[PDB]
DNA sequence: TATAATGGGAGCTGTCACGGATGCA
DNA sequence: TGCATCCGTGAGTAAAG
């Protein structure tokens, strides 16, 4: 279904705050921000989709994503909070794209 | 939810299929209802103060404390509760019942309490001299539903008693939330002075809790049954 | 890179007979 | 166990065009 202004603002906000949270998690863990984003995305989407990303320096298989998810789950409460932030941001990203898929059609029909 | 109408169910509360969720909504399934973007945030701010009252000794109903609605005294004839200080009247009417506060220069000199059954005979800001009627108590009088008497201290003087009540009650203040604002506080949580309730785009539209109180969410944009 | 924009158009047609798979009663 | 019904497929050679 099509979003209401409130749902749109809420999803966009969660997306922005999740990107900020991935930045903060890279600050803390000293890991790579892109690898962190890929791990959060992998868990949000499920094991249905897991593949090697071109920019990543490591091959993204369920073993390494479990390792990184464990290094994330072993954080203090005020640190591990950013993990939940990022997860909810990714879920909002997916639902925002899916909610606005109709606009693409209504534009592309004229090309 | 249509505009302005409120929810007949509460946030976090489990529901049943067919159970109506609002005056125009009936949930098709069972489970945990959830609020989507509450538009009005009401905070019940708590207040622990000290207020006095003088009554005939015959009408009094002696107790160590008073639960809400409980009878405080029963009067055979109309009685005039008179001022025992001189000042300007700060009238503060609750849902039912009121508080009178007297202040001389600016500092309060008397804080009275008029439970249900006492019609105040004064207007906010009025000047009162010592001994003039602040309220008439007619017949039985009882505590309001919104305020409770934690402790009671009495003093016998002549044919009257003077009660120094240790009162505790809550006062509501509403806040209007806009679609660009999000509630960062759950239902029924406790805030302090300085805690944030509703964030916004710019800091000057945020909702900060002035004092301590209990948060209540009303008028959600929609209700999500999961 | 910033008003808002939120579900598509074209079908197009005078066989024909068979063989084999699907669909009902 | 028997029928109607539908879908796919094939329907002459050389020449020029």
Residues in chain B closer than 8 A to A5 (CB atoms): 179
**Residue A15 in tokens:** 């997306």
Please work out, in degrees rounded to the nearest 5, the angle formed at the alpha carbon of residue A63 by the alpha carbons of A58 and A69.
90
Among residues A19, A31, A80, A77, the alpha carbon closest in space to that of A58 is found at A31
- Rounded Cα gap, residues B182 and A8, in angstroms: 12
Q: What DSSP state is assigned to residue A53?
A: -
Rounded Cα–Cα distance for residues B68 and B45 (Å): 18
- Tokens (6 digits) for B63: 């107790």
Question: What's the distance, Cα to Cα, between the start and end of chain A in Å?
Answer: 25
- Give the structural domain span for A104: 1-111
Give the nucleotide with minimal C1' distance to the Cα of A99: C6
Picking from B36, B180, B222, the nearest residue to A9 by CB comes out as B180
Tell me how far CA of residue B5 lies from CA of A6, B34, B43, B214, B215, in angstroms: 18, 16, 19, 22, 19
Q: What is the CATH number of the domain that holds A10?
A: 1.20.120.1810
The CA-based angle B152-B154-B158, given to 5 degrees, is 160
- Residue pair B84/B54 in contact by the 8 Å Cβ criterion: yes
d(CA B26, CA B24): 7
Residues belonging to chain B? 226
Helices (H), A30-111: 33-45, 62-73, 77-108
Chain C nucleotides reached by a protein CB under 7 Å:
5-9
Chain centroid to Cα B209, Å, comes to: 17
* Radius of gyration (C-alpha) of chain B in whole angstroms: 22
Q: In sequence order, what are the beta bridge partners of B174?
A: B42
β partners of residue B54: B162
Rounded Cα distance, B167 and B151, in Å: 7
Beta-strand runs (E) in chain B: 14-15, 20-22, 25-26, 31-56, 71-74, 79-82, 87-93, 98-103, 108-114, 116-120, 127-128, 133-142, 147-157, 160-176, 182-183, 190-191, 196-199, 207-208, 213-225
Phi, psi of B4 (to 5 degrees): 85, -30
Residues with CB under 7 A from strand C: A 2-3, 8, 99-103, 105-106, 109-110
Take residue A40 and report the two structure tokens written for it: 């959060």
Considering only residues 161 to 200 of chain B, which have any Cβ-Cβ distance to chain A shorter than 8 Å?
179-180, 182
B82 touches chain A (CB under 8 A): no
Of B102, B147, B145, B146, give the one whose Cα is nearest residue B120: B102
Distance of CA B32 to the CA centre of its chain: 30
**CA distances (Å), A16 to each of A26, A58, A100, B133, in order?**
16, 26, 17, 62
Q: Does A9 touch chain B (CB under 8 A)?
A: yes
Choosing among A2, A3, A6, which should be mutated to test the B contact, i.e. which has the most B CBs within 10 A? A6
List the determination method: X-ray
Alpha-carbon gap, residue A26 to A19, rounded angstroms? 11
Closest to B179 (Cα-Cα) out of B33, B3, B38 = B38
A47 marked ligand binding residue: no
Distance CA B117, CA B72 (A): 10
Nucleotide nearest to A102 (CA to C1'): C6
Q: How many distinct structural domains can be found in chain A?
A: 1
Tokens 């499920």 appear where? A46
User: Under a CB-based contact definition with an 8 Å cutoff, are residues A75 and A36 in contact?
Assistant: no
A44 DSSP 8-state letter = H
* CA gap B40, B183 in Å, rounded: 10
First-to-last alpha carbon distance for chain B, in angstroms, is 17
CA distance B219 to B38: 5
Residues B176, B211: Cα–Cα separation, whole Å: 18
| Closest approach of B178 to chain A, Cα-based (Å) | 9
Give the closest nucleotide to A12 (alpha carbon vs C1').
Answer: C2
The angstrom resolution of this structure is 2.8
């Amino acid at each position: 279904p099509l979003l209401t202004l409130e749902e749109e603002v809420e999803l966009a906000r969660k997306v922005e705050e999740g990107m900020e949270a991935i930045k903060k998690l890279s600050e803390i863990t000293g890991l790579d921000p892109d690898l962190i984003r890929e791990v959060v995305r992998a868990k949000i989407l499920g094991s249905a989709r897991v593949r090697h990303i071109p920019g990543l320096k490591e091959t993204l298989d369920p073993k390494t994503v479990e390792e990184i998810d464990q290094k994330l789950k072993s954080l203090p409460k005020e640190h591990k909070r950013y993990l939940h932030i990022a997860r909810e941001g990714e879920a909002a990203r997916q639902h925002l794209i899916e909610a606005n898929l109709r606009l693409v059609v209504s534009i592309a029909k004229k090309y | 939810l249509p505009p302005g109408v409120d929810a007949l169910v509460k946030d976090g509360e489990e529901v049943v299929k067919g159970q109506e969720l609002a005056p125009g909504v009936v949930s098709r399934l069972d489970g945990v209802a959830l609020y989507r973007f509450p538009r009005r945030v009401r905070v019940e701010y708590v207040k622990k103060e000290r207020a006095g009252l003088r009554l005939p000794l015959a009408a009094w109903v002696e107790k160590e404390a008073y639960k809400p609605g409980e009878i405080l005294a029963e009067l055979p004839e109309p009685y005039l509760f008179r001022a025992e200080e001189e000042g300007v009247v700060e009238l503060k009417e609750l849902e039912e019942g009121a508080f009178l506060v007297l202040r001389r220069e600016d500092e309060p000199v008397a804080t009275y309490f008029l439970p249900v059954g006492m019609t105040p005979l004064v207007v906010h800001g009025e000047i009162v001299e010592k001994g003039q009627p602040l309220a008439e108590a007619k017949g039985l009088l009882r505590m309001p539903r919104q305020v409770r008497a934690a402790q009671v201290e009495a003093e016998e003087e002549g044919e009257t008693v003077y009660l120094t009540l240790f009162l505790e009650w809550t006062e509501p203040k509403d806040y209007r939330v806009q679609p660009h604002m999000n509630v960062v506080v759950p239902e029924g949580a406790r805030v302090e002075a300085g805690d944030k309730i509703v964030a916004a785009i710019d800091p000057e539209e945020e909702v900060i809790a002035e004092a301590e109180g209990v948060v209540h969410l009303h008028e959600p944009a929609s209700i999500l049954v999961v």
